[PDB]
Design a protein around this ligand. Sequence first.
Ligand SMILES: O=C1C[C@]2(CCN(S(=O)(=O)NC3CCN(CCNC(=O)c4cccc(-c5cn6cc(C(=O)NC7CCC7)ccc6n5)c4)CC3)C2)C(=O)N1
Ligand SMILES: [Zn+2]
Length: 319
Amino acid sequence: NIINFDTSLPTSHTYLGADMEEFHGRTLHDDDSIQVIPVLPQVMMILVPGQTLPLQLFHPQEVSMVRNLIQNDRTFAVLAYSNVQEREAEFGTTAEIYAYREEQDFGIEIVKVKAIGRQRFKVLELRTQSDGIQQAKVQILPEGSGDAETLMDRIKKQLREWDEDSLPSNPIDFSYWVAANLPIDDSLRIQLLKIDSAIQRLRCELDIMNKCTSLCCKQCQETEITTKNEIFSLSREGPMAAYVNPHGYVHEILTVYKACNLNLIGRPSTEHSWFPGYAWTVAQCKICASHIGWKFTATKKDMSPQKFWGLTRSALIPT
Ligand SMILES: O=C1C[C@]2(CCN(S(=O)(=O)NC3CCN(CCNC(=O)c4cccc(-c5cn6cc(C(=O)NC7CCC7)ccc6n5)c4)CC3)C2)C(=O)N1
Ligand SMILES: [Zn+2]
């Protein structure tokens, strides 16, 4: 309930690298325009405009694609797969690289990037080259706003009950902040993205956060892991942010203060820690033993909070 922590520290993704080449030029595709944007193969998430996405690529094809993209408009396509295994996606969001680093070592050539969601699109064609790089023929969607600040002042009211402003004031920007930080599942995330007007998004987004109770283990159905009132915001991105592990896997985690039915595996560690100053420990379900997230404990008595949890969306479902 008290915070001694640079909340703007997790957004920097210091674990990735000390200093990376920043990029300031901004590409924004005109409304209803048809573009050919390449797709990163391993990324399997629902990206929201403004959501930051970190990446660590080791395959020579991914390195060759992003090395090429850096010299151009630095924009790749993140599809919102309707079925993950079937590669079936009809919508998606563009991602613009704003940070980049070329590290060798480990015998391989690596590229670490930090992208951010820009604009949604409707997929027209999804064609794969002979090498393997997937290219997407997409149609940029238009961004409608509207006059309904009462809806924003109602979202902000229930948001502050679960955690104690500094939120976006733009009705459009705030509509996507809510879409990226609410503990909703993928199917609901797509419904928010398919919505065109911010008024519909904000009016809809009000409808779910009243029907959202608690989060339970996916493999277990009825194992209450945390409630909608334990949400803690330790980052400027909010209570929901994406972080990449040493292997390159992106985890969309949620920061909560109290969690139940969780077993910690081993002793705390500070290696590659996503929250500088804290140590991590693998948290597992008590019954089914499926990985739920990580327990973060402070390494100093001067900082606060002393403990919190970061659980991934892929292991939890609302109930
Ligand atoms: O603050 C933060 C938070 C964290 C801290 C670190 N994480 S974590 O995501 O890395 N680890 C978590 C914990 C492990 N997983 C749950 C349990 N295991 C499983 O279910 C499971 C099932 C089947 C296969 C495997 C598996 C593990 N293997 C490791 C290697 C490898 O090369 N090992 C060497 C290099 C290190 C020695 C190779 C093959 C491989 N197969 C595992 C979930 C991921 C995030 C961070 O990075 N920063
Ligand atoms: Zn379980």
